[PDB]
Paper text:
Pyrroloquinoline quinone (PQQ) is a soluble redox cofactor used by diverse bacteria. To achieve this, Escherichia coli uses the TonB-dependent transporter PqqU as a high-affinity PQQ importer. In addition to its role in PQQ import, PqqU acts as the cell surface receptor for several E. coli–targeting bacteriophages.
However, PqqU extracellular loop 6 coordinates a metal ion, which we modeled as a Ca2+ ion based on the analysis of the structure and density maps using the Check My Metal Server.
Author numbering: 39 to 699
């Protein structure tokens, strides 16, 4: 339970996630999680940037500093690079956001862990056709067949959740149209009374134009413009298909075992806005990336519920996650006469086989020291080996083959005292560890060929106190944390969508996370939350001035959410949500700043139940007051193209037609 979790945890229920929502972006529904900053870039190539307590704000694409599991399959790779685009919002049961590295039961992460579980098929079988049309020619439809052959408690009882969605959009920005085909199957079969097998299949094909960032003047003059995106035809194709086998068994009344194996393949092509000039350097990797990532893994854990002086539940396991990378880079241009025609795959400029695999023994323990006092104490020993074998050796571009090994002990602990049956205080300490991604190692600020292997991994020590109190039909959670990070990986510079990274010697985050979910008499929901986050450099990361003490860019000091929704089981329902985002620094120097903004969204729908049929029609207006703001920044953009403008007042209408057999 959230209240019983001795750490900052938020659980966003899938149905609330789908309540009058487009079901396109996680930002639609995770906005109410304190300490979780979800930057919508209006860009399905780089996609949503998720940060937990400031960790991940450096991510120029996908997510970093957050370990994301989608139905047990890591969306975060052994190099720490993650993607949220494969999450099927239409089929999510719930999203668990764990803030802080306070559990050894998840891989290393500086910020936290996000677990997305797909709905388990239940009775009655249901086929749900969902559709949604929103501003900018946004159109997401989908079919979800979710059912089961029994209660799931008998051998051979099968549950299934098959869900396919097609999303298309012209995009708010110029050159930001995107198409995402998503398929997501969660099958389960009870082998016998003791065991349960679960198949996960996930597939996502994306073709998204990349609008890029705008300078302040560009954003002010025309927020929709994407001039570099037009010139370079910056765009991204993704094709990721993963499968997962989760075998759970009960070996005894006190013992359980769980083996989660997975294997997926992600094919990426990304045309970037790097001009020809830098690519004329033989050491340059070009302006187009083609990536073929084959990831597999097996996490085998044993949970024993015994007593050593006091009751103690320990989950000890071994996690293996391997990823191979066939990574190629081409010129993003071909020369017509003497002029580069961009948006084209040119001459090969990079060709390497990278291999990043981590092996982590881990042991989590939960001692009931007293009736009210409990102690989590876990340690994960993460050993990560990276090996780049460079196949691109030309004059001025030598053998860039290298390797690295990071071996980190990650202890976490938590003392939780039950003030009352409804009020728990907790004090959690934890060590987080973040290796640089392969892409973060790929590029040197000095422009020479070879990986930036001087990029050290970051290690963060997080202390946190917290208090969760049930205030009726709801939870009030307060968390106060300090995270001191050594060698924090930060964006050094970004140009044309390509980012070099460096290590900030010392950073400090001090934050408070208040959350309040409450259901009132009469189908009323109130979800409030406030995040305060002082994320500062404790060392100078700037090459030209003292930025020591400056706010870390990409991180809002304050975020706020307040949604009130009248959502009865059927009939007319409605809701409104105010989302405050504090201003965000776009550079280490704290000279470029995305202004703070308040976004008021409204929605109203009608659910009609006619025996086996449910028709949920709804209309929503996001950014009700038409606030001009920037939904995401590109930190340390070398040309000051920090700003990813957000739409303005926009609308959507959705229909969810469910038939229960
Ligand atoms: O979705 C992906 O798998 C993926 C991979 C990569 C990569 O590893 O090169 C990039 C991106 N996306 C991306 O969106 C992006 O803007 C980007 C820039 C670069 C680079 O090498 O400069 N890689 C990538
Ligand atoms: Ca080389």
């Amino acid at each position: 339970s959230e209240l019983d979790t001795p750490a900052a945890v938020s659980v966003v229920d899938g149905e609330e996630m789908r309540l009058a929502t487009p079901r396109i972006n996680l930002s639609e529904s995770l906005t109410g999680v304190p300490g979780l900053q979800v930057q919508n870039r209006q860009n399905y190539a780089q996609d949503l940037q998720l940060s937990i307590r400031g960790f991940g704000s450096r991510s120029t694409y996908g997510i970093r500093g957050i370990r994301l599991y989608v139905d047990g399959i890591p969306a975060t790779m052994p190099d720490g690079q993650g993607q949220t685009s494969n999450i099927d919002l239409s089929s999510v049961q719930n999203v668990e956001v764990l803030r802080g590295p306070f559990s050894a039961l998840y891989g290393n992460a500086s910020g936290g862990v996000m677990n997305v579980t797909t709905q388990t098929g239940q009775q009655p079988p249901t086929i749900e056709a969902s559709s949604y049309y929103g501003s900018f020619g946004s159109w997401r439809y989908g079919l979800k067949a979710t059912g089961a052959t029994g209660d799931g408690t008998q051998p051979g009882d099968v549950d299934y959740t098959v869900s396919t969605t097609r999303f298309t959009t012209h995009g708010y920005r110029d050159h930001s149209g995107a198409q995402k085909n998503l398929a997501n199957a969660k099958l389960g079969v009870r082998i016998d009374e003791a065991s349960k097998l679960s198949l996960i299949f996930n597939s996502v094909d994306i073709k998204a134009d990349d609008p890029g960032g705008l300078t302040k003047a560009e954003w002010k003059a025309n927020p929709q413009q994407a001039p570099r995106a037009e010139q370079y035809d910056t765009r991204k194709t993704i094709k990721q298909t993963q499968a997962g086998l989760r075998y759970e068994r009960s070996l005894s009344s006190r013992d359980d075992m769980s083996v989660m194996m997975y294997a997926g393949e992600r094919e990426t092509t990304q045309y970037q806005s790097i001009p020809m000039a830098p690519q004329l350097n033989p050491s340059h990797a070009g302006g187009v990336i083609t990536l073929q990532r084959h990831y597999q893994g097996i996490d085998s854990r044993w949970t024993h519920r015994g007593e050593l002086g006091v009751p103690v539940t320990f989950t000890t396991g071994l996690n293996y996650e391997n990823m191979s990378e066939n990574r190629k880079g081409y010129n993003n241009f071909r020369l017509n006469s003497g002029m580069p025609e961009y948006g084209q795959k040119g001459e090969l400029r990079r060709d390497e086989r990278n291999l990043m695999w981590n092996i982590d023994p881990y042991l989590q323990t939960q001692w009931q020291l007293s009736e009210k006092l409990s102690l989590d104490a876990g340690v994960r020993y993460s050993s990560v080996w990276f090996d780049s074998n460079d196949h691109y050796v030309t004059p001025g571009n030598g053998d860039d083959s290298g390797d690295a090994s990071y071996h980190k002990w990650l202890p976490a602990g938590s003392l939780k005292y039950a003030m009352t049956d409804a009020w728990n205080i907790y004090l959690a300490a934890g060590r987080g560890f973040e290796t640089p991604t392969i892409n973060e190692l790929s590029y040197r600020a000095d422009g020479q060929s070879g990986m930036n292997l001087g990029l050290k991994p970051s290690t963060n020590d997080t202390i946190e106190i917290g208090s969760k109190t049930r205030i009726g039909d709801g939870l009030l959670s307060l968390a106060l944390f300090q995270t001191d990070t050594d060698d924090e990986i930060v964006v050094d510079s970004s140009s044309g969508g390509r980012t070099t990274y460096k290590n900030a010697g010392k950073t400090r985050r001090q934050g408070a996370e208040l959350a309040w979910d409450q259901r009132f008499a009469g189908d009323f929901r109130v979800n409030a939350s406030w995040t305060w986050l002082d994320a500062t450099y404790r060392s100078n990361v700037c090459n030209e001035q003292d930025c020591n003490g400056n706010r870390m860019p990409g991180i809002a000091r304050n975020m706020g959410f307040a949604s009130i929704g009248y959502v009865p089981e059927d009939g007319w329902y409605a809701g409104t949500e105010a989302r405050y985002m504090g201003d965000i620094m776009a550079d280490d120097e704290n000279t470029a700043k995305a202004p703070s903004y308040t976004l008021v969204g409204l929605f109203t729908g009608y659910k009609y139940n006619y025996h086996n049929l449910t028709v949920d029609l709804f209309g929503r207006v996001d950014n009700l007051f038409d606030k001009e703001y920037v939904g995401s920044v590109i930190v340390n953009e070398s040309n000051g193209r920090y700003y990813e403008p957000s739409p303005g007042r926009n609308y959507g209408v959705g229909m969810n037609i469910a038939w229960r057999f």
